[PDB]
Design a protein around this motif. Structure first.
Motif, PDB file in Angstrom:
ATOM      1  N   UNK A  67       0.949  -0.990   0.214  1.00 49.87           N
ATOM      2  CA  UNK A  67       0.031   0.128   0.073  1.00 49.87           C
ATOM      3  C   UNK A  67       1.030   1.203   0.131  1.00 49.87           C
ATOM      4  N   UNK A  68       0.605   2.270  -0.550  1.00 50.06           N
ATOM      5  CA  UNK A  68       1.318   3.626  -0.558  1.00 50.06           C
ATOM      6  C   UNK A  68       1.159   4.381   0.678  1.00 50.06           C
ATOM      7  N   UNK A  69       2.228   5.043   1.176  1.00 53.37           N
ATOM      8  CA  UNK A  69       2.294   5.794   2.339  1.00 53.37           C
ATOM      9  C   UNK A  69       1.028   6.527   2.780  1.00 53.37           C
ATOM     10  N   UNK A  70       0.557   7.227   1.645  1.00 54.00           N
ATOM     11  CA  UNK A  70      -0.720   7.985   1.458  1.00 54.00           C
ATOM     12  C   UNK A  70      -1.791   7.195   2.159  1.00 54.00           C
ATOM     13  N   UNK A  71      -2.291   6.473   1.279  1.00 57.81           N
ATOM     14  CA  UNK A  71      -3.521   5.456   2.142  1.00 57.81           C
ATOM     15  C   UNK A  71      -3.328   4.878   3.461  1.00 57.81           C
ATOM     16  N   UNK A  72      -1.914   4.214   3.324  1.00 56.30           N
ATOM     17  CA  UNK A  72      -1.454   3.755   4.565  1.00 56.30           C
ATOM     18  C   UNK A  72      -1.603   4.708   5.644  1.00 56.30           C
ATOM     19  N   UNK A  73      -1.360   5.971   5.585  1.00 48.66           N
ATOM     20  CA  UNK A  73      -1.646   7.107   6.556  1.00 48.66           C
ATOM     21  C   UNK A  73      -3.158   6.899   7.149  1.00 48.66           C
ATOM     22  N   UNK A 130      -3.534   4.357   9.239  1.00 48.61           N
ATOM     23  CA  UNK A 130      -2.591   4.646  10.394  1.00 48.61           C
ATOM     24  C   UNK A 130      -3.747   5.114  11.400  1.00 48.61           C
TER      25      UNK A 130
END
Lengths: 48, 148
Positions: free
Chosen positions: B1-7, B10
């Motif tokens: 997953x990209x850090x974006x969607x993972x944020x 989060x």
């Protein structure tokens, strides 16, 4: 990084995304390499 | 997953806590995952949770690098359906064969089969997609379940 990216630079199936996916793929477990802080989404890599 | 969607994940993790230290109950795993672009069956999740019963299902804890790997370990997925699969799989209340579906029975399957829905869960999916006689046009009930 550079070598995977030379190859990836000459590449259509290859996204800055799949560059980091190829970096996790090839390196991963190396005692000088580290993944992102979960930000695959931003696609980044922490290295020693 | 990209850090974006993972944020965003989060946060969808961070919100759901108990003692205040990065700790999500097993229970919440699939539901948070479901909102995160996924519909992981209780059976799918139960695999990647390790078969709890209701007691330690309610009691056992996740943490983020147990949750986010789980998310992923279902997310890259095998069979997950499309319209053609689900028109047959929702012709699933055709009574004679009618292009429209059985009102009580759509509720009952949802109580009676595998992943037993409550009354609550059953009624919500079904309600007001029937007519006067209680026939549901499944051809549409399908797209409703498959997108939204």
């Amino acid at each position: 990084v550079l070598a995977l990216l030379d190859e990836e630079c000459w590449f259509p199936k290859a996204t800055d995304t799949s560059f980091v996916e190829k970096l996790i793929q090839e390196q991963g477990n190396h005692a000088k390499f580290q993944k992102s802080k979960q930000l695959k989404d931003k696609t980044e890599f922490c290295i020693l | 997953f990209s850090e974006e969607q993972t944020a965003e994940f989060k946060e969808a993790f961070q919100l759901f806590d108990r003692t205040g230290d990065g700790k999500i109950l097993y229970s919440q795993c699939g539901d948070v995952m479901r909102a995160l672009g996924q519909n992981p069956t209780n059976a799918e999740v139960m695999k990647v949770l390790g078969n709890p019963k209701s007691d330690e299902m309610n009691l056992k804890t996740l943490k983020f690098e147990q949750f986010l790997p789980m998310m992923q370990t279902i997310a890259k997925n095998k069979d997950q359906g499309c319209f053609e699969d689900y028109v047959e799989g929702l012709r699933v209340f055709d009574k004679e064969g009618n292009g429209t579906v059985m009102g009580a029975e759509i509720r009952h399957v949802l109580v009676t089969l595998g992943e037993k829905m409550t009354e609550e869960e059953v009624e919500q999916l079904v309600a007001g997609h029937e007519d006067s006689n209680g026939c549901i046009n499944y051809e549409e009930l399908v797209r409703m379940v498959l997108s939204g």
